[PDB]
Design an enzyme around this catalytic site. Structure first.
Site, PDB file in Angstrom:
ATOM      1  N   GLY A   1       0.797  -1.215   0.000  1.00 23.75           N
ATOM      2  CA  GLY A   1       0.000   0.000   0.000  1.00 23.75           C
ATOM      3  C   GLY A   1       0.834   1.271   0.000  1.00 23.75           C
TER       4      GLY A   1
ATOM      5  NE  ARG B   1       3.568  -1.081   3.520  1.00 21.98           N
ATOM      6  CZ  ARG B   1       2.462  -1.816   3.619  1.00 21.98           C
ATOM      7  NH1 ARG B   1       2.435  -2.909   4.376  1.00 21.98           N
ATOM      8  NH2 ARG B   1       1.376  -1.457   2.953  1.00 21.98           N
TER       9      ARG B   1
ATOM     10  NE  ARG C   1      -1.369  11.571  -9.780  1.00 23.48           N
ATOM     11  CZ  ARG C   1      -2.535  12.184  -9.607  1.00 23.48           C
ATOM     12  NH1 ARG C   1      -3.106  12.219  -8.409  1.00 23.48           N
ATOM     13  NH2 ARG C   1      -3.130  12.761 -10.640  1.00 23.48           N
TER      14      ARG C   1
ATOM     15  NE  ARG D   1      -4.427  -5.190  -0.123  1.00 24.75           N
ATOM     16  CZ  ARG D   1      -3.798  -4.532   0.846  1.00 24.75           C
ATOM     17  NH1 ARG D   1      -2.690  -3.842   0.597  1.00 24.75           N
ATOM     18  NH2 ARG D   1      -4.302  -4.541   2.070  1.00 24.75           N
TER      19      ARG D   1
ATOM     20  CB  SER E   1      -1.303  -4.901   7.837  1.00 24.55           C
ATOM     21  OG  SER E   1       0.100  -4.773   7.729  1.00 24.55           O
TER      22      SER E   1
ATOM     23  CG  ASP F   1      -5.478  -3.312  15.296  1.00 24.52           C
ATOM     24  OD1 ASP F   1      -6.710  -3.413  15.493  1.00 24.52           O
ATOM     25  OD2 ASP F   1      -4.733  -2.560  15.961  1.00 24.52           O
TER      26      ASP F   1
ATOM     27  NE  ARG G   1       3.251  -1.864  12.460  1.00 24.97           N
ATOM     28  CZ  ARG G   1       1.967  -1.968  12.799  1.00 24.97           C
ATOM     29  NH1 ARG G   1       1.624  -2.429  13.996  1.00 24.97           N
ATOM     30  NH2 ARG G   1       1.022  -1.600  11.943  1.00 24.97           N
TER      31      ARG G   1
END
EC number: 2.4.2.1
Lengths: 237, 237, 237, 237, 237, 237
Positions: free
Chosen positions: D20, D24, D43, D87, D90, D204, D217
């Site tokens: 996302g 990363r 962008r 994809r 998390s 989470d 994480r």
């Protein structure tokens, strides 16, 4: 016994093969099952239980449409302790490159019905099958030299839909076959926490109008049943 | 023949009574009709044609749910020339004043199925019965000393609904009975230009969990068939 | 008195005919009613109460559209004790076999409105009239040599709709006439436990754009009003 | 180049891993690939192409939400010949038995979005992953010693949903995790005939408001990256 | 002449003030206008044309509910060349900080009606008012010494809604008042390219069931009519 | 502080301009702001804080689509004390008279999304802007010699939408421009009681694909930025 099944707990196995036609259930019991006994016939919806290669396996029809199958799947799951449900049937194809006699594995199931929307607060619920059952079916199919297409099915409410253009839409998104209950069985499975799978054989093409010749039709039907029964075997080991 | 009915044009009468259970079709044929001949048996969905006071009358089951009965109803109309379809069955009552063994004539039918919206460009299509048929049923009932309640039925898609709150809404707008196919039959009749009506008898009470015993069940059923039969005779003049 | 009706309990009879136009209410009062006095005029919606053959009957306008008439019917029901509501009006015809001057009775009513869905948790509510009121109207009609067409009406929210195609769908599903409030009135009746009915006269053919002349308009109107009054008397027997 | 990607056709490999966060993506390029190079950045949405065990593989951030990832996935497929899309992100869990750090594989993906219905004539499109890619990911995880959970994800449009009751409905129908784009990617894949799959780590837990620590994480993320990269290699065999 | 307006082209000014009550129209004409003549009275819906400071202006009731006001506005725009419409009416408030007698200008209008969705392919259409007409209404109010509240109105189809929970949602999103036609007017305006606006005075409070007194009501009504009139003059410049 | 913004309280001005691209955020801050300091960079979403003519203001990218911008907007309002948000972007025009390089101000925002429905019990929520913010902008523009167009925008979920027909419906109802996030921002502004405004410049025509040079775009972008900044100063008076 439940309002739609004249049987007691234990009379059914943990896995049930469900064809649409109750008579197809009779056939499967008498052709693939050993020492098969009739366990139900309330509304003519014949049901049997027997052994396949030493494993207990039940067979029962589910009627036509999501409402019909939903009822039977709920009771089996809830009152009879059924853990795995495998629907065996036929589907019509829209995709030109999908030929007759092709085995289709319903990984997911799109639908016309509102059953999923009532359950899922009017959001999009992806009616999917159990990964492991789909895997087993794939592995069991190729073991028989059959190439199965794992993909999306379309569960229709109306066999005679007044919306012809929908076939074009289905084709654009690559639905492999259109039938009438996979999505419902999947909703019921998710709701009552059970595992399900729908396997279909393309009996006729919506585009290239042609149906399978009776002889070859019954041959492919048996290939599908073998695939199912073998996947179960492959699934408990 | 049709893919769901193994009959020939002429094998069915212009009027067909349709109970949900295939075995009930057989019961009617063997008890009320004269010289009843089996005309259908494909998926165990037994169909029979016989005589009643000289009147040629057909009887055949429709299965469970809107999609199932919709297929049969459509085929009977378009392929076998059936003009009138009369559904005989039972329903659950939600209103306190509606009691067991009451005869309910579905003048209209509410539903949570999306089949009507698919037909009616997503607007409200009031699935209603034929007036003369409704009237004929009230006259026959009255002559038999059976008081009938004419109103709205509710055709549910899910016999086992996750929305228990809907029963309150149903009660709020006074629906007489809950069942599973009235709306679909009325939808089909309107689409193909036929006449339809669904008569029901209260077999259970949603609120006060009351059920009809086996004895009453048979008795009231008989009264219902009696009503539908005389109804047809009244409609011939 | 209510925010829309400047009258007290007793100023309205237990049954009230409701034309669209308040001027038409004044007409009925002075042409058919005896000793009819004005009981309301809050917003020009003239309301009257008088007698017909010694029976106390009232007449009041309901305005154009479901939201409008839904207010007046609601209030009359809960605050003025009205038991029966009989809307009398006009409509357009889609079916070619439905001619001008025909009197159509609304047993059911489809709608472009969302009112029913707000009440019925977004499902399909069959907005139906009261059966007894329907046959009573039909009987009164035949007593005057008039054969009324009983079926589905369509309550449109938009007179000038940006969707012309909707008429075609209406034609195939046999709706007898297009008007604008039967659906709302029926919804209100069901919500508050009252009886209602809508009788219309075909003023024009939407397809073959042919309108009834002002002369024919008068003759047909009188006939319809007669039918409505006579049906009421029949309902008292 | 396209309106959102300043690269020439051929700059991207046939398979693209998409996290996302663009940072990363950069992390994966500098940490897991060899001779990686920046192939896009219009962008700030960084896109890199490098190699992994001699295999050419691309990595590019896709942004938050279905609308953002939908633009990129489509462009890659149509103008960059990208065949497969994976994809990696998390998700939050709602089922009690789904623990933090658990690797969830989205065989299917439910959603709040109206994008699918817009493509599917307002019917239920079951947004699913490519069976083969799911199988490969499962095996890759297995080989690495990680027990993957295959099932349904939920793609929410509103990260801050005013509707909290939805989480309980999700829990009731076994969704494994809630994220924000899988359903969109699967919809695009089906529209443009490409292959997709989403793999997520449970960072989470909605119910017992527990979250993963900084260390947990970073480490679990890398495990996921390995599973994805290895599943591709496994896919070429 | 139109199916609902017997007036002729030219009989109406380029701008019309549209109160709910046909009688309020009468009051306005016989108070704020000079040389006012009755150009319409068909269904008791009084429509007058006069002059206010040399500025020709028409006033006409529109009935209650979106369907009613939609008919009159459409005909006025399409056949009578009316360019601007100004609905003058009351409105109930739900926000605690909104007091009675308050002047609310509806920049936008939410709704329960399905009319917009029918127009917008079932998507969300922001039923908005004309900016300049809003700005002018605010200015006129300022000059008159009144501080108007500009925001969202809610046009309800049902005055007696079955769900009072919606009022809490209305509050949650800060809607200024709930009336019954703004959204329909704005929709027609957009559909035909005319400019529209609605001005309301808070006649009562939903939460605190308190109605305004007839005394305060009359003066407030006059203040609002003065605003709408003063704004028309501002727009002419 | 928040999971999507690594800044702290006081680091943001009470007003924030929001272009779609974070690179633009950087541009605005280094071309129009004094002593601009980078305040956030988490997902490359560059956020800045500086001073314009003494007035302290922030600039930050929001990503593409309603879901992305909904996240940032919510966090700014509820966690960083932002009182008003101004979105600065580009939009494609459908109306012929709407020319390239024109400035469009979204007074209202129609949408493809389902987010508003989720918040407004499946009813029509009029996604509107803050009136004051709208008039300040039109005034700032007038002072700059630019006559802005105030009306409706369409916030689309799919940049690559399969329904090409929607463009004609939009044209018919006068939407000024198509973009992807106005209706979402206005939705968040309403839920958390903040003020918002979206200003856009016509980059190209969706109809006749007239494309302007990067040079002309640059210039026009700056005009919009100047308008947005000036309106803020006017908002302090």
């Amino acid at each position: 016994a439940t309002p739609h099944i004249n049987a007691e707990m234990g009379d059914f196995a943990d896995v049930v093969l469900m064809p649409g036609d109750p008579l197809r259930a009779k056939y499967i019991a008498e052709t693939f099952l050993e020492d098969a006994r009739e366990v139900n016939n309330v509304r003519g919806m014949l049901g049997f239980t027997g052994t396949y290669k030493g494993r207990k396996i039940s067979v029962m029809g589910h009627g036509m449409g999501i409402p019909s199958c939903s009822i039977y799947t709920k009771e089996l799951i809830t009152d009879f302790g059924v853990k795995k449900i495998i629907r065996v049937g036929s589907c019509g194809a829209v995709l030109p490159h999908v030929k007759l006699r092709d085995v289709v594995i319903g990984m997911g199931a799109c639908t016309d019905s509102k059953v999923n929307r009532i359950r899922f607060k009017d959001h999009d619920f992806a009616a999917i099958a159990d990964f492991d059952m789909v895997r087993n079916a794939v592995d069991a199919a190729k073991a028989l030299g059959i190439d199965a297409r794992v993909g999306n099915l379309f569960s229709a409410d109306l066999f005679y839909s007044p919306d012809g253009e929908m076939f074009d839409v289905m084709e654009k998104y690559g639905i492999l076959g259109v039938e009438m209950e996979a999505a419902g069985i999947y909703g019921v499975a998710a709701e009552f926490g059970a595992k399900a799978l729908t396997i279909c054989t393309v009996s006729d093409h919506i585009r290239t109008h042609e149906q399978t010749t009776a002889a070859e039709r019954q041959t492919t039907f048996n290939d599908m049943i073998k695939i199912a029964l073998e996947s179960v075997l492959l699934g408990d080991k």
